[PDB]
């Protein structure tokens, strides 16, 4: 019994530690309300998921009964909804508010956090109906109270709300909530709130594959630049994925490599896996040889091994070998949603091979290129190089005599100037860095 | 209300007087209550069934009469009415074939975003089965990879709903594409080169080629005109962007 | 990094550590051959008196080292294959498909086709072994690899090289490094404002 | 050995002699400045201060 008692006492001590973390959060909002500072509010929201992986129904009820010294609607909602365990030997001195503290009404900011902290806790407990009711109470309370600092709270609150509703499969129903809060965000200039709702909306269109509506909305909705880094990465990746579906190739590779760079390197393992798959499929279709150093990813060895064989097949130009491995391990590609593209790469392998061999050779025979890439037909080889030049990917031309292709030439007026023309935005970066310093040199 | 669902449209409807009957169908039956909710009311479910039936009839009539405004209007109505997927209703039959014809002609309008988003909405409808709908996919695939004449032979048969006119309208898009492809950096174009190998063995197409675009016919040969030049560069837009940089860090 | 700290002929023992002083030299020759083709290496390793002495000890090792120095490809390729076979029998076999013979001939082919403009495939084949098709497929494979800055006129079987000028090649290097550092500063622009 | 300035055009059976302008060493010097002023600073500084 000694080992069991020690383990229970230890886990109860960590429960009290988590309660002190929640108590620290309450003190953070008390300082935040006193100082009118939403930045230290963001720190509280950043540190919550770190301790969110270990909570207990009993310690949550401890914080609920302690913080709600004065009777309030939040306590009446959590009394039936939160299911604490049976009697526990551990109790704490619950008296945080006395006198004027209990007399004063509850802060709207802490009310939004308790509602958001319950809905994260219900999903941690894998509950759905109680989670949706608390979240509906959260948006109802946030809508009723019209303070400026609450909309910054409302951004991540609406974010995790629709994430719950995605598990509920109400991701279609929540669209009315997302759009309604978008209009409120537009009225109140809530860029972070706007940023969250489009990200939720795009994932909604992703889960239903409603890409035509997604592209029609992205093409008309302006996304805030100064939004949260995580929300920026999710929006940029979703924009990158749809452009890849839309065949917007050069924009896709730019967005996906930016999204990978904008994502945290230490975290976002699932996001990282998706972007590796996205870059492998898209760049192989382009013929842009995938980055070899990306294969050293410790979390993507098994997924990229068939991708490595796909890269080898793209370079070689063979068909049967990779068709077999797609039949073997193509189910994950279907789950990622790139199998339609996967077949497109399977039949654009010749196009990529033509570009590489055209860059390799000056005047290559149309028969030679057909033999190299398994065409076995002079006419099909002529059509392919016809189809390559009209796309503008390569400079290989056609002379119906033998298939002549022009070579390069010495450097002209604009060939030394096209780098500086496309790179003189250095000062544009410098000016926004200076302007950000202008915004961020508060003395007190 | 629920009058002559397909009383005369099933066997043969070649007359123009049926437009008035269709208009009366729209006024009375199509406008009964709505097509949006489709929550219950199996009567409205049958209303959606007849709505789809008259849309496909209009699609066949429009593609046979070659009226772009009416055909496009029927296409958009077909898309909006089919926006309500109800799985309990019997799918396929009218779905895969019509969507193939609609998408195939949409590529003749040079639209690929709608083509691929419908493909993603159909995970196994396009690849596993339904040659009715993958025929445009195969045509686009060949027309993108390596084929011009092989596409023409591939276009020779439509398994979807016959109606071998989307192949001709794609033939009208590839004649434009081929003409643009040969208006590219090609070195020379013989008269027999443009007439025999690709397509259009001495039709009115040949007169269209010899009159519309440039590359005037020399001796049985069209040749590229002045498109690449040394261009002694006045170099004025580099000065403007230099001034743009100057003013950019002449301030702040 | 290997060669720069390994040409030092100061051994802790007369014949130990790397199994011998002769084995020490063979590592030096292999590493140097991977390093560079023919700058003033005559004044770097060839001038080495102890180097010349040990190549007298090993005639075969002296054979390919002088073959590369003399740029005589008829004996070089046969000796280069012998080098690869010898490296196969050695546990330092890590560049199994990258830098046994392919990298050295990339340096050799670059050395050969530079100072040349259009050298015929047929005659460069007999000047670099035999099997005109073998050299033709080797050139195509290496151009696809990225090196051997040249193109092949298959309809006439000519090797039309494209050597950039000192200005042109260097300007290409700057725009590449400009691409990398724009990627760097964009990443740093991500680091700020978050 | 860079003792001569030309390219051997065997196809034409000639050797094209070109007067190489050596004043273009600003190009290589600029690249060295790019390499030793950026690589040694951006990776080291902004990996040490990863969090900001």
């Amino acid at each position: 019994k000694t080992a069991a008692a020690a383990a229970e006492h230890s886990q109860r001590e960590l429960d009290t530690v988590t309660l002190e973390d929640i108590k620290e959060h309450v003190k953070q909002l008390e300082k935040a309300v006193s100082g009118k500072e939403p930045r230290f509010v963001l720190r509280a929201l950043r540190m919550l998921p770190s301790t969110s992986r270990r909570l207990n129904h009993y310690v949550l009820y401890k914080a609920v009964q302690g913080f709600f010294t004065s009777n309030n609607a939040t306590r009446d909602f959590l009394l039936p909804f939160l299911e604490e365990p049976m009697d526990t030997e551990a109790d704490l001195q619950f008296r945080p508010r006395t006198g004027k503290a209990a007399s004063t009404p509850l802060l709207p900011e802490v009310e939004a956090y308790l509602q958001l902290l319950v809905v994260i806790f219900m999903m941690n407990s894998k509950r759905y109906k109680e989670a949706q009711k608390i979240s509906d109470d959260l948006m109802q309370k946030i809508s009723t109270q019209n303070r400026r600092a609450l909309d910054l709270v409302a951004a991540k609150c609406y974010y995790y709300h629709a994430r719950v509703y995605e598990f509920l499969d109400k991701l279609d129903v929540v669209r009315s909530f997302l759009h309604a809060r978008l209009r409120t965000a537009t009225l109140r200039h809530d860029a972070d709130g706007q940023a969250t709702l489009l990200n939720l909306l795009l994932r909604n269109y992703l889960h239903y594959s409603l890409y035509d509506q997604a592209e029609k909305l992205v093409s008309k909705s302006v996304f805030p630049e100064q939004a949260n880094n995580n929300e920026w990465a999710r929006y940029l990746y979703y924009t990158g994925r749809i452009k890849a579906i839309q065949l917007e190739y050069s924009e896709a590779r730019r967005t996906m490599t930016n999204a990978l760079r904008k994502a945290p390197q230490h975290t976002a393992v699932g996001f990282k896996q998706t972007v590796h798959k996205l870059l492998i499929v898209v760049e192989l279709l382009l013929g842009e040889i995938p980055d070899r150093l990306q294969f050293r990813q410790p979390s993507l060895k098994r997924s990229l091994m068939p991708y490595f064989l796909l890269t080898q097949a793209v370079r070689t130009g063979n068909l049967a070998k990779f068709n077999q491995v797609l039949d073997q391990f193509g189910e994950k590609f279907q789950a990622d949603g790139t199998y339609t593209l996967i077949i497109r790469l399977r039949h654009n392998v010749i196009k990529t091979g033509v570009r590489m061999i055209s860059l390799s050779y000056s005047r290559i025979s149309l028969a030679d290129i057909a033999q190299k890439l398994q065409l076995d037909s002079p006419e099909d080889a002529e059509f392919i190089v016809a189809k390559a030049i009209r796309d503008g990917v390569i400079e290989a031309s056609i002379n119906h005599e033998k298939g002549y292709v022009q070579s390069k030439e010495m450097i002209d007026i604009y060939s030394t100037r096209e780098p500086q023309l496309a790179f003189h935005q250095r000062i544009s970066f410098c000016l926004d860095i200076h302007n950000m310093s202008v915004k961020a040199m508060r003395f007190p | 209300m629920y009058e002559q669902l397909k009383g005369e449209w099933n066997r043969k409807s070649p007359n123009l007087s049926k437009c008035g009957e269709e208009l009366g169908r729209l006024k009375l039956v199509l406008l009964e209550l709505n097509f949006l909710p489709t929550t219950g009311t199996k009567l409205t479910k049958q209303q959606l069934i007849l709505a789809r039936d008259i849309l496909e009839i209009g699609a066949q009539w429009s593609i046979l009469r070659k009226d772009i405004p009416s055909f496009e209007r029927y296409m958009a109505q077909l898309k909006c009415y089919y926006f309500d997927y109800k799985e309990q209703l019997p799918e396929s039959a009218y779905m895969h074939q019509l969507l193939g014809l609609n998408l195939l002609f949409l590529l003749s309008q040079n639209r690929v975003a709608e083509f691929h988003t419908e493909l993603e909405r159909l995970p196994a409808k396009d690849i596993q089965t339904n040659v009715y709908i993958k025929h445009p996919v195969s045509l686009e695939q060949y027309l993108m990879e390596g084929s011009y004449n092989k596409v023409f032979l591939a276009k020779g048969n439509i398994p979807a709903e016959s109606y071998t006119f989307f192949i001709d309208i794609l033939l009208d898009t590839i004649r434009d594409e081929i003409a643009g492809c040969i208006e590219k950096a090609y070195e020379k174009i013989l008269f027999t080169e443009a007439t025999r190998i690709l397509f259009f063995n001495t039709p009115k197409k040949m007169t269209d080629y010899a009159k519309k675009r440039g590359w005037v016919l020399g001796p049985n040969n069209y040749y590229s005109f002045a498109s690449q030049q040394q261009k002694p560069e006045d170099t004025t837009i580099p000065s403007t962007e230099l001034a743009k940089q100057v003013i950019e860090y002449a301030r702040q | 990094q290997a060669a720069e700290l390994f040409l030092d002929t100061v051994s802790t023992f007369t014949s130990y550590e790397l199994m011998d002083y002769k084995t020490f030299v063979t590592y030096t020759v292999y590493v140097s051959m991977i390093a560079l083709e023919r700058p003033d290496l005559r004044e770097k390793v060839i001038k080495g008196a102890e180097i010349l002495e040990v190549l007298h000890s090993l005639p075969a090792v002296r054979q390919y080292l002088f073959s590369l120095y003399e740029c005589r490809y008829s004996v070089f390729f046969q000796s280069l294959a012998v080098v690869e076979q010898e490296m196969k029998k050695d546990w330092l076999f890590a560049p199994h498909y990258r830098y046994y013979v392919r990298e050295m001939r990339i340096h050799a082919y670059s050395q050969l086709l530079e100072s040349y403009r259009s050298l015929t495939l047929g005659y460069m084949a007999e000047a670099f072994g035999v099997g005109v098709e073998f050299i033709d497929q080797e050139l195509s494979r290496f151009i696809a690899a990225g090196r051997l800055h040249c193109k092949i006129d298959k309809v006439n079987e000519i090797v039309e090289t494209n050597r950039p000028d000192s200005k042109n090649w260097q300007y290409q290097e700057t725009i590449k490094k400009g691409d990398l550092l724009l990627n760097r500063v964009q990443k740093l622009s991500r680091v700020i404002n978050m | 050995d860079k003792k001569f300035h030309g390219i051997l055009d065997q196809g034409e059976g000639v050797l094209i002699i070109f007067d190489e302008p050596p004043v273009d060493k600003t190009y290589e010097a600029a690249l060295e400045t790019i390499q030793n002023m950026s690589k040694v600073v951006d990776s080291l500084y902004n990996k040490a201060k990863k969090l900001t």
Binding site: - | - | G178, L181, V185 | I34, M37, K49
Partner: peptide, 30 residues
């Protein structure tokens, strides 16, 4: 490459130094 970029880099260095100082001041003020 070597005046506009250098100005951008040094300005970037100043901002990230200021941002670090401001973040530390905000966190450790109380």
């Amino acid at each position: 490459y070597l005046a506009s970029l250098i100005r951008s880099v040094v300005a970037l260095h100043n901002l990230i130094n200021n941002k670090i100082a401001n973040r530390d001041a905000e966190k450790k003020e109380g």
